[PDB]
Write an enzyme that holds these catalytic residues in place. Structure first.
Site, mmCIF file in Angstrom:
data_model
loop_
_atom_site.group_PDB
_atom_site.id
_atom_site.type_symbol
_atom_site.label_atom_id
_atom_site.label_comp_id
_atom_site.label_asym_id
_atom_site.label_seq_id
_atom_site.Cartn_x
_atom_site.Cartn_y
_atom_site.Cartn_z
ATOM 1 N N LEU A 14 1.010 -1.160 -0.038
ATOM 2 C CA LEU A 14 0.153 -0.099 0.224
ATOM 3 C C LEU A 14 0.848 1.379 0.360
ATOM 4 O O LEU A 14 0.448 2.314 -0.094
ATOM 5 C CB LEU A 14 -1.100 -0.190 1.458
ATOM 6 C CG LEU A 14 -2.355 -1.498 2.061
ATOM 7 C CD1 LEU A 14 -2.805 -0.860 2.772
ATOM 8 C CD2 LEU A 14 -2.272 -0.940 0.160
ATOM 9 N N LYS A 64 14.671 -7.355 2.937
ATOM 10 C CA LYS A 64 15.301 -6.507 4.193
ATOM 11 C C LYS A 64 16.240 -7.354 5.336
ATOM 12 O O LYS A 64 17.358 -5.869 5.142
ATOM 13 C CB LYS A 64 14.064 -6.473 5.308
ATOM 14 C CG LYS A 64 12.594 -6.301 4.828
ATOM 15 C CD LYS A 64 11.862 -4.777 5.750
ATOM 16 C CE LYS A 64 11.830 -5.379 6.510
ATOM 17 N NZ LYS A 64 11.038 -4.186 7.303
ATOM 18 N N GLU A 76 22.865 2.758 12.319
ATOM 19 C CA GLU A 76 23.170 2.373 13.396
ATOM 20 C C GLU A 76 21.232 1.819 13.870
ATOM 21 O O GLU A 76 21.924 0.364 14.587
ATOM 22 C CB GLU A 76 23.679 2.643 15.319
ATOM 23 C CG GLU A 76 24.676 3.542 14.635
ATOM 24 C CD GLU A 76 25.857 0.912 14.761
ATOM 25 O OE1 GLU A 76 25.869 0.740 15.999
ATOM 26 O OE2 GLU A 76 26.815 1.665 13.397
ATOM 27 N N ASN A 85 15.358 -1.376 5.823
ATOM 28 C CA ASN A 85 13.464 -0.818 4.855
ATOM 29 C C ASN A 85 13.796 0.507 4.133
ATOM 30 O O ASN A 85 12.761 0.758 3.538
ATOM 31 C CB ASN A 85 12.346 -1.206 6.248
ATOM 32 C CG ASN A 85 12.766 0.510 6.707
ATOM 33 O OD1 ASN A 85 13.149 1.590 6.574
ATOM 34 N ND2 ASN A 85 11.369 0.941 7.070
ATOM 35 N N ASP A 100 11.203 1.464 10.326
ATOM 36 C CA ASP A 100 10.110 0.514 11.131
ATOM 37 C C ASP A 100 9.894 1.144 13.141
ATOM 38 O O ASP A 100 9.004 0.970 13.538
ATOM 39 C CB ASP A 100 10.576 -0.629 11.368
ATOM 40 C CG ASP A 100 10.255 -1.370 9.489
ATOM 41 O OD1 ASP A 100 8.949 -0.762 8.951
ATOM 42 O OD2 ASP A 100 10.676 -2.461 8.667
ATOM 43 N N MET A 151 14.124 -17.319 27.123
ATOM 44 C CA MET A 151 14.904 -16.431 27.427
ATOM 45 C C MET A 151 16.137 -16.367 26.766
ATOM 46 O O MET A 151 17.030 -15.405 26.940
ATOM 47 C CB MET A 151 15.553 -16.968 29.390
ATOM 48 C CG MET A 151 14.523 -16.466 29.891
ATOM 49 S SD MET A 151 13.224 -14.872 29.951
ATOM 50 C CE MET A 151 15.087 -14.449 30.543
ATOM 51 N N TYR A 204 -1.854 -4.459 11.576
ATOM 52 C CA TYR A 204 -2.783 -3.464 10.920
ATOM 53 C C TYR A 204 -3.908 -5.390 10.326
ATOM 54 O O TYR A 204 -4.932 -4.289 9.905
ATOM 55 C CB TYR A 204 -3.357 -2.450 10.979
ATOM 56 C CG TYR A 204 -2.611 -1.938 9.930
ATOM 57 C CD1 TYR A 204 -3.186 -2.421 8.510
ATOM 58 C CD2 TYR A 204 -1.160 -2.550 9.256
ATOM 59 C CE1 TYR A 204 -2.336 -2.031 7.143
ATOM 60 C CE2 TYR A 204 -0.177 -1.875 8.170
ATOM 61 C CZ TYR A 204 -1.595 -2.092 7.010
ATOM 62 O OH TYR A 204 -0.622 -1.465 5.829
ATOM 63 N N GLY A 225 -1.667 -1.402 14.168
ATOM 64 C CA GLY A 225 -0.094 -0.899 13.850
ATOM 65 C C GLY A 225 -0.125 -0.357 12.423
ATOM 66 O O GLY A 225 1.404 -0.066 11.678
ATOM 67 N N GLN A 232 6.209 4.864 9.909
ATOM 68 C CA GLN A 232 7.531 4.203 8.548
ATOM 69 C C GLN A 232 7.884 5.054 7.533
ATOM 70 O O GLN A 232 8.919 5.229 7.358
ATOM 71 C CB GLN A 232 8.617 2.873 9.160
ATOM 72 C CG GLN A 232 6.562 2.012 7.756
ATOM 73 C CD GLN A 232 6.801 2.053 6.620
ATOM 74 O OE1 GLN A 232 8.283 2.263 6.114
ATOM 75 N NE2 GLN A 232 6.038 2.306 6.053
#
Length: 264
Positions: A14, A64, A76, A85, A100, A151, A204, A225, A232
């Site tokens: 989109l 990506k 960074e 992105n 993002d 973890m 979303y 989202g 973004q």
């Protein structure tokens, strides 16, 4: 100027529609095009972009990470999550960014009052979690909490945050003002969820994931989202152009599209 989004497939993006609404509001005579780039052609990416005189492009699935070896430099924020992105073509050099995490946080800042003092829980320990935690760390005073079922996947996190498991998250859930789900059935029990807590998901599609539905049923404000997707792209635009994007026009056109209220 000439812009693009590269990906395979690409026709569902989109991004071209959204970016065009921003061009229209700002009277910019620019292109933003979906560019189909199969993995099997990806070794030729420099030729593919350069031939079309593209000044900047977004990068979606499955490139990506794949893009990185082809960059001249990389920021960074992008090195930190291991994904690009956004690419800037400046005098033929390719410079990588990642908008993002900052897009998510910039959206969240405008609907949440007093994020500096928020106690924040993030669910998931992957790249999308790390990108968001990276930006929140800069502006949130209470130390951040991240919950994962294992973890061990915090093993590559340099960031000094509280690392908990899911059942601990569930039993201490009333201690959090904002819960941010980044995991792909509501992922955590919401039985101990406080009434005021903002529940959020980076997705979303669907417009409400199961966590958002269960939370909203208890009366909690929910946040998908969509803002993250617009912010973004708006951030990529600021890198490329030094202009100020029209957030409302960009969001409103995506809403129209998802509502099927656009004609073709």
């Amino acid at each position: 100027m000439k812009f693009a989004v590269i990906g395979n497939p690409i026709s569902h993006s989109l991004s071209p529609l959204m970016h065009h609404a921003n061009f229209q509001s700002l009277n910019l005579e620019n292109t933003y095009e979906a560019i189909n780039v199969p993995v099997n052609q990806f070794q030729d990416i420099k030729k593919i972009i350069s031939e079309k005189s593209i000044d900047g492009f977004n990068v979606t699935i499955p490139h990506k990470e794949r893009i990185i070896p082809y960059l001249d430099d990389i920021n960074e924020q992008a090195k930190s999550v291991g994904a690009v992105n956004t690419v800037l073509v400046k005098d033929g050099k390719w410079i990588g960014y990642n908008t993002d995490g900052i897009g998510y946080v910039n959206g969240l800042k405008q609907i949440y009052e007093g994020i500096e003092d928020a106690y924040i829980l993030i669910l998931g320990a992957g790249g999308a979690s790390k990108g968001i935690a990276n930006e929140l760390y800069k502006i949130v005073r209470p130390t951040l909490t991240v919950a994962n079922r294992t973890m061990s996947r915090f093993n590559n996190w340099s960031l000094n945050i509280n690392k908990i498991n899911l059942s601990h998250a569930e039993s201490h859930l009333d201690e959090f003002d904002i819960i941010i789900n980044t995991t792909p059935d509501s992922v955590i029990s919401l039985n101990r969820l406080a009434s005021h807590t903002l529940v959020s998901d980076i997705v979303y599609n669907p417009y409400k994931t199961p966590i958002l539905i269960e939370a909203e049923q208890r009366g909690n404000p929910i946040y998908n989202g969509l803002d993250m997707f617009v912010h973004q792209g708006a951030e990529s635009f600021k890198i490329w152009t030094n202009l100020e994007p029209d957030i409302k026009a960009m969001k409103n056109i995506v809403i129209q599209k998802l509502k099927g209220e656009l004609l073709e």
